[PDB]
């Protein structure tokens, strides 16, 4: 609580299995490392009933999904949200 509110969603990893990624019902992704359980940024997520995620294989993109039907993609090499996607009815 690394701050999450409820039932945590998918936990993802840096390509090397480090810097794990998590969010839950709370609208934020935390990217935190292993043992050295330190945060690099708050990857604010969707205001979803619940969120969801996968990260592009290169570890560059956080695909922020969730129970609501807005979808957005993050660029981890920048730390910006790239943008909120058109989405067009997708509670991914």
């Amino acid at each position: 609580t690394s701050d999450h509110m409820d039932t945590v969603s998918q936990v993802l990893f840096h390509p090397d299995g480090t810097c794990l990624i998590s969010s839950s019902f709370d609208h934020k992704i935390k990217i935190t490392d292993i043992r050295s359980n330190k945060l690099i940024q708050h990857y604010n997520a969707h205001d979803a009933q619940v969120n969801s995620i996968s990260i592009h294989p290169t570890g560059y993109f956080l695909a922020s999904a969730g129970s609501d039907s807005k979808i957005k993609i993050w660029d981890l090499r920048q730390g910006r949200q790239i943008y909120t996607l058109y989405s067009n009815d997708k509670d991914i």
């Binding site: 945060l39 690099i40 940024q41 708050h42």
Partner: peptide, 24 residues
């Protein structure tokens, strides 16, 4: 950068909590 906001921030809340609690 926003991680530095977390740095107390939230760091002392958990201990700011604690005293008083058992006394009650």
């Amino acid at each position: 950068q926003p991680k530095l906001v977390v740095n107390n921030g939230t760091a002392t809340y958990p201990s700011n909590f604690v005293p008083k609690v058992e006394e009650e």
